[PDB]
RNA sequence: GAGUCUAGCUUCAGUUGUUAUCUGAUUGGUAUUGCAUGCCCUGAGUACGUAAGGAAAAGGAAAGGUUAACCGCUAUUUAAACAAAAAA
RNA sequence: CGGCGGCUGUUGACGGUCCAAAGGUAGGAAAAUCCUUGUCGGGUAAUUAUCGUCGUGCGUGAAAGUUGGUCCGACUCUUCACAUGUCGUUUAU
RNA sequence: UUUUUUUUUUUUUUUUUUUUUUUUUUUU
């Protein structure tokens, strides 16, 4: 090429909202559908930047419609997954998670590098507020209020800047015109928690950080290490 | 009809369409006279409308269903089955003739 | 529509007179069915019908009246008629756009 | 709208059933209501007395017609009326007649508002 | 030295065609028209003419046709269907 | 086993004369042939295109294969009917 | 919600609309 044609042709051309994909629409939709399930099952995927900016559109809608907990919404959620494992995870680990998160459960990170074999850009599509995340996420709900109160109590500048905002949240005592002293008073029960229903055993489980541990040892690799397979097989040339 | 001439007009017909808008809203009426069918659309907001009356109504949930903006049941519409065709000049892929394909198989 | 005249067509005239006398439709069309045979005339009919009498009734009852009316003249199994209520005239979107010949009789 | 080689009926009671258009003052086939056109008679009744080439004016049009007041008017058929010596040949007009007719022949119609 | 808005030049066709004397306190002294198809109306049944017959100065309007612009209305086609509650 | 015609007189059955083995038979006939508009009739707002017919305008010509009842048709042409962006005049995915 | 004529509007200006270029700098 010439590198000038690109510029000459692009004059007075509108941008496309939805990025084109190789194949018929029926194929494209299938592709995106399957990639959504694969993204749900992993927690981070490595994809090209254009594609990473495209899959995030449905990545948000899936979680947005999964939290309604309605027959109608359930249908739409059903209409966007394939495998049962993704359904299970979405309905048992992600829904409880984003209980207090209004929106924006995903992000895109650019790698600023080119593929060796393709010379193409690369990016990561990782969920927000997940173990081993690239960067930490901000608090929401009562956590946010506590953060804000901390900020306020830290220094004068924070107090001044958050003065207006604090009023709405109720962190300012109207009876004395000062920041609330006790912040735990604004604690409320969240949806994620378990409502109240109202031993000397040797087989008792042991507390541990993600899931408990059994009092017995089982000779078994992790879930991700008990099923091996060759990634790729060479194809001999036929001269 | 004519303000100067003081000529009025009275039309009668059955409602066929009600275009729901803000200011450009209109209603379409259809009738027959001596076997010839006539149709006329009248805007809602017009200064010429002398009077408007209803002779017979059809109050029922069916009318309410038509008088409401419904939402898609599912996101299946994105499939776009009508686009799944075969090129005339394209390679033979199965036993499908040139044109739109079928989903039974 | 029809350039020249056409051979005598008494059944078409009888159907037009009977439908306009009993069903009092508002959008009634008729023509000869060529899909049944090109070398045959005045045997098969096809058209569109719509009358207020079909409001608040199911399709079974709607078509039962048409069949009963056709029985009185002896053209039951020779007319392919599509009928919809006036309120649901939008269902006939893709049935009016088509050409409609003008038989002389 | 209307165009050459078009078959249109007659609203008058002269006896003619239909006629073929021969000419019109248009290029893009957008014939309007009230436009003079030449017709050739194709069929006639056993008791007709119309000429071979009657001259008339478009009365009714299938295509919708826009109004000055933002309304629209539509018909189910295309019919014309014969004109002779600046007057209609017949004595009555079948069906309604639209308002968009400068000619005074519309008075013979039964319902001008319909 | 630098930012903005601009003078001059340039621009479809084409031209050089404009103002003596000067209301005595008396309602004041040229003024954005270059241009042009057909049919209808006022002027007008007037000028003209035994009769038949039948003009112009000016303006006003309904078709057809060309160029350009635009999406308020209509027609064709087509897409979208997601975050008001700090108890969330 | 190549083919088969002149003058002249009354629309003209008939009469004169030259030549020759014999002097186009019948049928078809504006033609796989003359002429790229022969008269009249049917179709269309227009038909010289095409069918029917007349048999003169030039002319073809019988086991050289002529004519053709019925049946038959990947053989020219006239004409009727449905849909149709072939179209005036071009749009959207 | 977008495009289009099959819809709508104009048929005026030409010292006008518009524009890439401040020029007393006679040897960068």
Automatic annotation (TrEMBL), chain A:
Residues 190-203 are annotated as: Disordered. GO terms for biological process: translation. Keywords: Ribonucleoprotein, Ribosomal protein. Belongs to the bacterial ribosomal protein bL17 family. InterPro entries: Ribosomal_bL17 (IPR000456), Ribosomal_bL17_sf (IPR036373). The keyword Phosphoprotein does not apply. This is Putative 50S ribosomal protein L17. One of its GO terms (molecular function) is structural constituent of ribosome. GO terms for cellular component: cytosolic large ribosomal subunit.
């Amino acid at each position: 090429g010439w590198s000038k044609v690109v510029n000459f042709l692009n004059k007075g051309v509108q941008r496309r909202p939805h990025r084109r994909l190789p194949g018929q629409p029926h194929h494209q939709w299938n592709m995106l559908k399957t990639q959504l399930d694969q993204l749900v099952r992993s927690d981070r995927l490595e994809l090209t930047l254009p594609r990473a900016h495209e899959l995030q559109q449905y990545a948000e809608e899936l979680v947005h419609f999964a939290k309604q907990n309605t027959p109608e919404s359930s249908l739409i959620v059903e209409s966007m997954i394939f495998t049962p494992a993704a359904r299970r995870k979405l309905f048992h680990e992600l829904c409880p998670l984003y209980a207090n998160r209004p929106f924006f459960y995903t992000r895109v990170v650019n790698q600023h590098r080119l593929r060796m074999r393709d010379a193409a850009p690369m990016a990561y599509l990782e969920f927000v507020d997940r173990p081993g995340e690239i960067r930490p996420a901000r608090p929401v709900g009562f956590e946010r209020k506590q953060a804000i109160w901390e900020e306020m109590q830290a220094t004068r500048r924070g107090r001044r800047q958050w003065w207006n905002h604090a009023k709405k949240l109720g962190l300012i005592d109207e009876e004395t015109g000062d920041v609330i002293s006790d912040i735990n008073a604004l604690r409320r029960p969240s949806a994620a928690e378990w409502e109240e229903s109202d031993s000397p055993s040797p087989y008792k489980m042991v507390a541990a950080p993600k899931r408990a541990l059994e009092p017995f040892f089982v000779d078994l690799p992790p879930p991700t290490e008990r099923y091996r397979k060759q990634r790729y097989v060479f194809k001999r040339f036929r001269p | 009809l004519s303000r100067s001439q003081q000529t009025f007009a009275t039309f009668q017909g059955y409602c066929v369409e009600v275009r729901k808008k803000r200011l450009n809203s209109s209603f379409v009426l259809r009738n027959s006279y001596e076997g010839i069918g006539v149709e006329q659309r009248i805007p809602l907001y017009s200064p010429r409308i002398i009077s408007l009356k209803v002779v017979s109504s059809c109050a029922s949930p069916t009318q309410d269903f038509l008088l409401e903006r419904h939402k898609p049941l599912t996101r299946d519409y994105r499939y776009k089955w009508k686009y799944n065709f075969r090129g005339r000049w394209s390679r033979r892929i199965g036993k499908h003739k040139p044109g739109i394909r079928s989903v039974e198989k | 529509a029809h350039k020249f005249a056409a051979p005598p067509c008494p059944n078409l005239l009888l159907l037009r007179k009977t439908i306009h006398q009993r069903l009092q439709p508002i959008l009634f069309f008729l023509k000869n069915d060529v899909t049944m045979g090109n070398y045959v005339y005045d045997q098969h009919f096809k058209g569109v019908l719509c009358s207020p009498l079909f409001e608040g009734k199911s399709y079974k009852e709607i078509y039962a009246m048409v069949d009963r009316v056709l029985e009185d003249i002896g053209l039951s199994g020779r007319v392919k008629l599509y009928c919809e209520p006036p309120s649901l005239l939008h269902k006939m979107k893709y049935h009016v756009r088509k050409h409609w010949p003008l038989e002389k009789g | 709208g209307l165009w050459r080689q078009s078959i249109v009926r007659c609203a008058d009671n002269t006896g003619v059933i239909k006629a073929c258009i021969i000419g019109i003052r248009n290029k893009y086939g957008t014939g309007k209501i009230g436009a003079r056109i030449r017709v050739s008679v194709r069929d006639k009744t056993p008791e007709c007395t119309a000429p071979k080439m009657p001259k008339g004016v478009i009365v009714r049009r299938r295509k919708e017609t826009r109004r000055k007041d933002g309304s629209y008017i539509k018909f189910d058929e295309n019919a014309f009326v014969i004109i002779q010596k600046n007057k209609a040949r017949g004595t009555k007009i079948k069906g309604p007649v639209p308002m968009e007719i400068r000619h005074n022949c519309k008075t013979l119609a039964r319902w001008i508002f319909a």
